[PDB]
Amino acid sequence: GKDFFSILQQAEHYIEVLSANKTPAQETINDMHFLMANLIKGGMFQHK
Amino acid sequence: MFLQRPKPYSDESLESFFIRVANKNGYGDVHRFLEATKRFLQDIDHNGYQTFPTDITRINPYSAKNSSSARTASFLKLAQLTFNEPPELLGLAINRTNMKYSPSTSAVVRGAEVFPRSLLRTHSIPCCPLCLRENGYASYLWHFQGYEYCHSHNVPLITTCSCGKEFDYRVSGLKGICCKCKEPITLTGHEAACTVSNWLAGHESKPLPNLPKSYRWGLVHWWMGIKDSEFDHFSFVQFFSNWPRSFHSIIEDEVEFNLEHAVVSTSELRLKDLLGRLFFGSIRLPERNLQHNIILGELLCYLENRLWQDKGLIANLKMNALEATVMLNCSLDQIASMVEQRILKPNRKSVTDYLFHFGDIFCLWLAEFQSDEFNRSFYVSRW
Amino acid sequence: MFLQRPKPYSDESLESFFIRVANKNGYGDVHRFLEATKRFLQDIDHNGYQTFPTDITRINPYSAKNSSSARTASFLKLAQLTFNEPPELLGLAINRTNMKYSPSTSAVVRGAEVFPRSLLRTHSIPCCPLCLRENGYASYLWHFQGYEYCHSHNVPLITTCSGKEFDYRVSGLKGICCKCKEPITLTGHEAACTVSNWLAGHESKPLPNLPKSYRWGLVHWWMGIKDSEFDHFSFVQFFSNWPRSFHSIIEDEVEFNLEHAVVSTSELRLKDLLGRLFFGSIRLPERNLQHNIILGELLCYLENRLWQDKGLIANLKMNALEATVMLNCSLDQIASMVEQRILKPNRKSKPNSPLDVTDYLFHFGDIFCLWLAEFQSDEFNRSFYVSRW
Amino acid sequence: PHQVDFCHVPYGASHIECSFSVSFSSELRQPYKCNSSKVKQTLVQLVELYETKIGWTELATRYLMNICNGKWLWKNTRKAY
Ligand SMILES: [Zn+2]
Ligand SMILES: [Zn+2]
């Protein structure tokens, strides 16, 4: 469950995990780091 | 580069070795030394180029997945290319192994001694702060969930100090200073566990047997196999206090309860039902070396003597072919070749169906599969 | 019926035990004795009811083909249903073993010690008539082609007397001849005495103190080097300077197969260069590197020279069916190791991984290292050889 | 006609310069396309909340490190003084 489009399927979860006043786990910020870097690389996240 | 090694110990964790070779030659912190060796493996072309670890927590090859080969290559090169005299750097490395422990659990070997993976302290590894201060190195045994007292100081291992609410030498530096407050870390059924921990190191203890230090952890993992969790040292030492008596009582008590509480009658009773957990939970520890695997030895001895006691109730226990391939190391292919050659007796004519008894398979193992160490003569001349 | 055994000797042939228990209780001839026990298992329910042998020579369940299980069952049944004190009967029965020796040769286990079938004396077993008359039992060692001198008497084992073929299973453990009635009184010796003594668990200092099972592995291996004709002086000299002799042998072999290699170096395989030695020492009795001393030294030599000449040894081509024997695993487990990319298949099989188990695809160095982690088993361990001479 | 090429440093060459130009830009703030705005919001807000909670310093550092040590010079530093 550590590809890109899988951790993008959980972006709604990450929104609320960040939105909490408490800091998130180290692994989840690693997941979000990879997600942000994959956005920085840009590309096509489509399913035709 | 060129380094000098310090006073090599036998029982010294690899991370401890890298600490005391970093802080010996030229480096302030061991992390810098890891980057230095990575640059070294850059200079001389290599494959550890990429995957050589720079965090100290993950140096042992069991940490890298699909890169353990490269890390052992790296340690080999380091050992004969970077020191005035070659160190035994690879023998200290905890790496995986192919052999399992009896119920579906993998194992990790260090030096000549293979431990179960079930007890490895994936995190929060303790320390003997005294032994740190005197010897100056971290013994490997601290990594395993049996070694709960220092076999040399009979002190419980300090896992968390007061200054450092959790401590480990892999970040400390083989010295007594906590993470937050710089100060000596040295603080503090005791004997019921001290003997067990001393016996876990290569040593002797009065109630526990003189098995190879690879089979001692096998005993421990088997005990946790009986005691569904919670390895306590007292029940262990008292269980080995009356050794041939306690285990015989155990197999009797487990065997008698199964025979009453069995839901299907005697002739179709199977051996994973009766003697189900003991037999297959002892069959492969470090290995079925009957001289060392004292548990399987005693179990097979007890079964052999009572093979024909009650209508041969033991002997005529149906075990499926796949359980014969475990009882005697073999392939379903090879037992198939044996039964079509008419070596075994598939009681009903005509592959994972229960078609063979225990007795015909036990005598089969006696006849055609008795190995060098998986050998009958090791247990018959016992107590 | 009820039997009793005299002075149970641990180092004794099964046939000899049966002889000295037949003559002890009530039987003048052993044939009647075995016949009587066959009937004793006749009235009893058993499966040896059919295939039980009456010939003394063919009782050891390695002679029993397709029926060793039933005969071992019979042996136990007697060991607990026929004696005052339980006899060590199944302990002396030389029988089949699933394990094998180095090149495709089966093995026979007796007690705790397993021997290569290749040296078994299928026929014409000798005897030590001095030992026979003095002891009254025939040790098992007389069955094996290595034991040709008696470690107890320094006398060569005799096969025939002036009785033109003497055999204990047909004589009766006495000094008497085949076609004449008289005793058997008759008879590089020193290089053979040490070997034949060391072949029983003992110490002959020019020979290693390995478990007595790996000693027969050594002898079968030496038969492997010199294609046949195991003679003891070559053995004792090859082990006189042990950390030097095998080193010279392996050095000369690798140099010879390198010099005359019909292939370049980048494609030089391990099968040709260093082929007979490695794959001929990988399982002498089993690959315990503490005992399997020759695999131990060969692996030490190769490790100490993995990267010597731009990776000569290291870059040696190895096939999957050679990885499966250098480090115990099935080619399906190797498939699982190479889809997990724990292995380095130097050539790309692009579509869907069609596993070719025969094409030279891995490097030896990268398989030696893969043995050093992921496969260093209990005793097949590196730390056994490195801390040696 | 396999045409294998060979680029070696000339004989008297004192050293060798390698020039390039890398541009960081804020093109990750808004998706270049989202045929469904409902997902565009949850990504622009994702980026905003990431930046607020765990600032850009980690990705920025791990990029600028590759820039500032020779890592774009892929293999040309194996044997370099
Ligand atoms: Zn200590
Ligand atoms: Zn003799």
Short mmCIF file of C-alpha atoms in Angstrom, two decimals, chain C residues 135-272:
data_model
loop_
_atom_site.label_atom_id
_atom_site.label_comp_id
_atom_site.label_asym_id
_atom_site.label_seq_id
_atom_site.Cartn_x
_atom_site.Cartn_y
_atom_site.Cartn_z
CA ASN C 135 36.62 -61.50 21.23
CA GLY C 136 34.06 -63.84 19.72
CA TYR C 137 32.30 -61.12 17.71
CA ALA C 138 32.79 -59.50 14.32
CA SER C 139 32.93 -55.72 14.37
CA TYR C 140 31.08 -53.79 11.70
CA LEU C 141 34.25 -52.11 10.43
CA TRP C 142 35.20 -55.38 8.75
CA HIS C 143 32.39 -54.61 6.32
CA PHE C 144 33.88 -51.39 5.01
CA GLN C 145 36.61 -51.06 2.40
CA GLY C 146 38.57 -48.67 4.59
CA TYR C 147 39.04 -51.04 7.54
CA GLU C 148 41.60 -53.38 6.04
CA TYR C 149 43.87 -53.39 9.10
CA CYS C 150 42.71 -54.20 12.61
CA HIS C 151 43.17 -51.19 14.85
CA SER C 152 43.35 -53.58 17.81
CA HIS C 153 46.12 -55.88 16.58
CA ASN C 154 48.09 -54.16 13.77
CA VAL C 155 47.41 -57.22 11.63
CA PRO C 156 45.93 -57.00 8.12
CA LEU C 157 42.42 -58.38 7.80
CA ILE C 158 42.35 -61.78 6.12
CA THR C 159 39.70 -62.78 3.61
CA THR C 160 40.73 -66.34 2.66
CA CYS C 161 42.70 -69.11 4.34
CA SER C 162 44.90 -71.78 2.81
CA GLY C 163 39.16 -72.06 3.57
CA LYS C 164 39.64 -70.42 0.20
CA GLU C 165 36.94 -67.91 1.15
CA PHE C 166 36.49 -67.34 4.87
CA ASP C 167 33.40 -65.49 6.08
CA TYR C 168 32.07 -65.08 9.61
CA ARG C 169 28.40 -65.27 8.59
CA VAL C 170 29.12 -68.76 7.24
CA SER C 171 31.89 -69.90 9.59
CA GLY C 172 30.29 -69.31 12.97
CA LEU C 173 32.75 -66.95 14.72
CA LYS C 174 35.33 -69.67 15.26
CA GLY C 175 38.78 -70.52 13.97
CA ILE C 176 37.66 -73.26 11.57
CA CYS C 177 38.07 -73.66 7.84
CA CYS C 178 35.65 -74.11 4.97
CA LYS C 179 36.90 -77.33 3.31
CA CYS C 180 39.30 -78.35 6.15
CA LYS C 181 38.94 -78.58 9.93
CA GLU C 182 41.73 -76.57 11.54
CA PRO C 183 42.21 -73.07 12.97
CA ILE C 184 42.72 -70.03 10.77
CA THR C 185 46.16 -69.58 12.34
CA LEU C 186 48.02 -67.33 9.90
CA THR C 187 49.27 -63.73 10.01
CA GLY C 188 53.19 -49.85 3.47
CA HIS C 189 51.85 -51.46 6.63
CA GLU C 190 52.46 -48.55 9.01
CA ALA C 191 50.81 -46.03 6.69
CA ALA C 192 47.73 -48.24 6.56
CA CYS C 193 47.58 -48.98 10.29
CA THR C 194 47.12 -45.31 11.15
CA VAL C 195 44.33 -44.93 8.61
CA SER C 196 42.51 -48.09 9.65
CA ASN C 197 42.80 -47.10 13.30
CA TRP C 198 41.63 -43.52 12.68
CA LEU C 199 38.71 -44.96 10.73
CA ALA C 200 37.31 -46.13 14.00
CA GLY C 201 36.82 -43.18 16.29
CA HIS C 202 40.34 -42.65 17.55
CA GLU C 203 43.29 -40.31 17.15
CA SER C 204 45.96 -40.59 14.50
CA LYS C 205 47.54 -37.19 14.75
CA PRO C 206 48.33 -36.81 11.02
CA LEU C 207 44.62 -37.23 10.52
CA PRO C 208 41.95 -34.78 11.69
CA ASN C 209 39.78 -35.47 14.72
CA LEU C 210 36.53 -35.18 12.83
CA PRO C 211 33.35 -37.06 13.76
CA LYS C 212 33.74 -40.65 12.70
CA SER C 213 31.02 -40.16 10.10
CA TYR C 214 32.90 -37.48 8.18
CA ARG C 215 36.02 -39.63 8.15
CA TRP C 216 34.45 -42.01 5.65
CA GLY C 217 33.47 -38.90 3.73
CA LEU C 218 37.14 -37.97 3.62
CA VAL C 219 38.05 -41.43 2.38
CA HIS C 220 35.39 -41.40 -0.32
CA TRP C 221 36.57 -37.94 -1.34
CA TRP C 222 40.17 -39.09 -1.62
CA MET C 223 38.89 -41.92 -3.78
CA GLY C 224 37.31 -39.11 -5.75
CA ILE C 225 40.59 -37.27 -6.33
CA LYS C 226 42.65 -40.28 -7.36
CA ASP C 227 39.95 -41.80 -9.53
CA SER C 228 40.01 -45.07 -7.53
CA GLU C 229 42.53 -47.13 -5.56
CA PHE C 230 42.40 -45.63 -2.08
CA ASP C 231 45.85 -46.31 -0.66
CA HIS C 232 46.78 -45.09 2.76
CA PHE C 233 50.19 -43.55 2.20
CA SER C 234 48.76 -40.96 -0.16
CA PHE C 235 46.09 -40.17 2.44
CA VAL C 236 48.47 -39.81 5.38
CA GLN C 237 50.89 -37.72 3.36
CA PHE C 238 48.15 -35.45 2.03
CA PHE C 239 47.13 -34.94 5.65
CA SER C 240 50.67 -34.70 7.00
CA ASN C 241 50.98 -31.03 6.01
CA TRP C 242 47.26 -30.37 5.92
CA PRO C 243 46.97 -26.55 5.70
CA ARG C 244 49.58 -26.78 2.93
CA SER C 245 48.86 -29.88 0.85
CA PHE C 246 45.25 -29.14 -0.04
CA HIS C 247 46.25 -25.54 -0.64
CA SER C 248 48.82 -26.70 -3.18
CA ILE C 249 46.28 -29.04 -4.77
CA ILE C 250 43.61 -26.40 -5.19
CA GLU C 251 46.13 -23.80 -6.37
CA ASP C 252 47.48 -26.14 -9.01
CA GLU C 253 44.00 -27.14 -10.15
CA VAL C 254 42.77 -23.57 -10.50
CA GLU C 255 45.95 -22.54 -12.31
CA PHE C 256 45.73 -25.53 -14.66
CA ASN C 257 42.09 -25.00 -15.57
CA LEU C 258 42.74 -21.29 -16.00
CA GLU C 259 45.77 -21.72 -18.27
CA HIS C 260 43.97 -24.26 -20.46
CA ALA C 261 40.55 -22.63 -20.37
CA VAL C 262 38.94 -22.86 -23.79
CA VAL C 263 36.87 -19.78 -22.93
CA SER C 264 37.72 -16.18 -22.15
CA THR C 265 37.70 -15.02 -18.54
CA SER C 266 34.51 -12.95 -18.70
CA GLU C 267 32.63 -16.14 -19.53
CA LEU C 268 34.77 -18.54 -17.50
CA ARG C 269 32.40 -20.65 -15.40
CA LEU C 270 32.79 -22.32 -12.05
CA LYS C 271 31.81 -25.72 -13.48
CA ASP C 272 35.05 -25.97 -15.44
#
